[PDB]
Design a binder for this molecule. Structure first.
Ligand code: B12
Ligand code: B12
Ligand code: B12
Ligand code: B12
Lengths: 195, 197, 197, 201
């Protein structure tokens, strides 16, 4: 797999060769393909390696900053459609960005105007922006479960006309308790908007 | 349209959630002022106005996030378009506890524009891990950007002294005294940083 | 619409005089393939297709001018974004009589992407003036791109030999023997050129 | 650095091969004088000073090339920022044999600033190929910039006639008589050129 190659280039600080390997993968598998076969497998392997204590925090930072940059390029290539926006973010306390960015990307690939805000947005401020921009939906990505548990019952229900929760840190019951529609796969998300 | 007006236009586009218009105005600014110029005359003035507005309680966190996430994305684009030389890298990051990342990215960018192989790691790197990577890659220098002063104050004396052969601290959160205490070379302007290396 | 058809789209936009559409298509390609990629998979294939069309008598020289002026402008943008390192410069140009400038610009760009301070002079520089500037600036190398062979053939033996400490000749109009005759190092690929310095 | 010193500074940076410093000084000029202003107060004065220096034998051709390639790059960015209107284009170029291209770019820029879709082709376009492109694009006008007079003199009588319904020749290398001989309207000032299209006569 180009996965091991990509990781090894990043770990030796070869950002030029890492970029070249990613670009080859994008040319070979296309935009959706490269995410499934390269970006996510590498991100998972970086996390695992760190958990095993095989790499330190600096190396993980390097890799994650790089993958985030590639995903941002893909986001930018999808363009930004006009229309009532969908705000994409993470719950308060959640700092991980890639799951939200992936969600924004899948929406944008299907012509949905997904505004990625960045992570960790307070719920009242998110509700206020959704209202001001006449947003049709809010989408939330949770990697950790703790930030969801800290939230009062029904706290996600009124953020916008539709509210979607996904990510490892989320499950059907916590979604029900919080008042959000739970969603496992990213492909289905655009269809779930009924447009 | 007018160069004299791009800051206002960019801010207004971001606040109404017009990412397409924002992108077009940034591109215009890049064409007008060039790579370094757009950062001085557009990106930073807008980022500062967003931050100020938030401090005055005029805008909420969500709006500020939108704008900052956008500006960060543009600086990353510029970073990628700059040359990356081979040779002993310079690691660029922020002190432990510092989450703001634009100042570090700006530093990496100015270095890369001047032929210095600056690896931006992202923010908030533990010092032992930073030291280990600097040693493994044979880094010639470590550059740290601090916007807040608190994260610097939490560090023990001489904590930045042996990170790499040269260690640079800058950002508004830093000053010559805190640099001396922590064992880093202070610098104020990004212009001078490439010459210093 | 599919990336592998950006080439035909770009060509069609240029031929109908749609500079705005051309710019948009090029930017899409840059986002898709990145800086080096867009040159390999869009700029060069389109420039070759313009040349072929001209050979088939489908378009005149004015259309070729339009397209090449456009591509030169895109390459210039990329050149500017790579930034210009300090240090002993490398002068990049074409032999006297050679007016085509894209191969030289491509060479300058690949060098600049690798931190080498490549000064693109433009095409068609007299050899005495080139030698004088190389000496005044303490240039480490001169790089020449030749598309046509005629301008090379008009030059006396050993005419490129003392232009600077290293002298490189490339381009389809050049081969190892004409390089040897003229006193330059020949190379085929732009990738190898940075390593060679 | 002060505005009254930008011209000298820019030239000196270019002559020592300091492209980074040159870029920074041009941007300072843009900040001071704005887009059109920088052309009048910085770009043209520097281009003229490069020419003068070359005449006085103080710089060779290599240095002039460096400087002109730089200024052409700046002017191209300004051209692109003027935007590209829709409609029947105006082709802008130089006569065959004319290699200087700044005058043509300046003409294209003034037209584009006034909403005219000026397509800058680059310099030195053979007249039959220019005629063919004007016809293919349905161009309403062709504009030619001549710095030198010799390339005009080499052209046969009536050689610029009917390249398009309107044909304009300008530049110091051109005069009313050579225009008449070649079958073009002569024009002195760039500002008037857009109006010269809107109201025909
Ligand atoms: C990679 C990783 C990291 C990386 C993060 C890399 C990055 N993303 O920048 C690093 C090394 C930094 C890391 C550190 C930490 N993480 Co970690 N690490 C992982 C790992 C190996 C993979 C996580 C992952 O796949 N995330 C990527 C996202 C995109 O995938 P996902 O959230 O599963 O979501 C999928 C779908 O739901 C969909 N999706 C995502 N969002 C949305 C939204 C919608 C609406 C939809 C429809 C779909 C969707 O896309 C994804 C495709 O599969 C796991 C272990 C494992 N085996 O999974 C943990 C794990 C998530 N980490 C964990 C922990 C504890 C941490 C740390 C606290 C460790 C520490 N002590 O410092 C820190 C900080 C976490 C934080 N503060 O957020 C725990 C979580 C435990 C829990 N929450 O109950 C895990 C499970 C491992 C463990 N220790 O058991 N981690
Ligand atoms: C933008 C901003 C924010 C934004 C940040 C958005 C983002 N970037 O993500 C937001 C609203 C989120 C924010 C948040 C906070 N910030 Co604030 N806000 C600002 C502002 C406006 C900073 C401008 C900025 O980002 N500049 C970034 C870089 C470009 O600027 P710089 O560091 O001065 O860098 C220059 C040079 O130093 C050089 N440089 C940079 N790095 C290096 C390195 C080297 C080696 C060299 C040579 C040069 C160099 O490059 C730059 C050239 O212009 C200031 C007020 C102001 N007008 O400056 C505060 C300010 C920094 N914020 C402040 C505060 C208190 C906060 C918060 C704690 C608010 C809060 N109370 O919760 C939070 C932080 C949360 C946390 N991490 O703990 C204080 C900090 C006081 C201190 N220094 O300890 C400031 C100074 C406001 C004040 N009180 O006057 N803030
Ligand atoms: C495009 C083209 C032109 C264009 C140029 C404008 C344009 N570029 O679109 C125009 C219309 C001017 C043209 C016309 C002519 N050219 Co023509 N045309 C071509 C064509 C199709 C493309 C090749 C090309 O120009 N690439 C552009 C450059 C950048 O790429 P390159 O030169 O291959 O260089 C590569 C490498 O060498 C490297 N490189 C470049 N410089 C350097 C420097 C260094 C140091 C290094 C390491 C590497 C390096 O990078 C480049 C890309 O990888 C080829 C046919 C083909 N090859 O498919 C001919 C070709 C070059 N043309 C040819 C001919 C015949 C001509 C004319 C004489 C035609 C005529 N019959 O009158 C005229 C003369 C030009 C003039 N009158 O001023 C012949 C060359 C003669 C031969 N050796 O047999 C070719 C080979 C095709 C053929 N018919 O046989 N041409
Ligand atoms: C710079 C310069 C050069 C530069 C050209 C710069 C470039 N573009 O690359 C260089 C050094 C290459 C050069 C070349 C030569 N040029 Co010279 N040099 C000059 C200089 C200083 C200015 C030329 C210039 O500014 N052109 C740029 C354009 C924008 O200026 P412009 O033509 O005045 O255009 C204005 C208007 O005409 C109008 N305009 C332009 N186009 C159009 C089109 C239309 C439709 C309209 C309405 C208006 C319009 O807009 C412009 C701004 O207001 C003059 C000296 C002087 N002016 O006193 C000579 C000068 C014109 N050059 C001269 C000539 C002919 C040459 C040379 C042949 C010198 C020689 N005798 O050996 C060389 C030839 C080398 C070559 N052919 O490549 C001599 C003429 C000698 C004589 N007749 O007595 C001059 C007059 C020097 C002098 N003071 O005597 N030159």
């Amino acid at each position: 797999d180009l996965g091991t190659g990509l990781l090894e280039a990043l770990l030796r600080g070869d950002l030029a060769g890492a970029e070249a390997l990613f670009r080859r993968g994008l040319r070979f598998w296309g935009p959706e393909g490269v995410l499934e076969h390269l970006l996510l497998p590498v991100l998972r392997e970086v996390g695992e390696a760190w958990h095993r204590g095989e790499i330190g925090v600096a190396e993980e930072h390097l890799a994650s900053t790089f993958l985030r940059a590639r995903l941002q390029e893909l986001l930018d290539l999808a363009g930004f459609p006009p229309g009532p926006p969908v705000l994409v973010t993470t719950p308060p306390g959640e700092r991980h960005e890639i799951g939200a960015m992936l969600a924004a990307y899948h929406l944008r690939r299907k012509g949905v105007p997904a505004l990625y805000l960045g992570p960790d947005t307070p719920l009242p401020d998110l509700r206020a922006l959704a209202r001001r921009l006449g947003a049709g939906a809010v989408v939330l990505s949770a990697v950790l479960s703790e930030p969801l548990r800290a939230l009062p019952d029904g706290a996600l229900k009124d953020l916008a006309p539709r509210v979607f929760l996904g990510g490892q840190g989320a499950g059907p019951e916590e979604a029900r308790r919080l008042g959000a529609e739970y969603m496992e796969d990213l492909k289905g998300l655009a269809e779930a908007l009924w447009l």
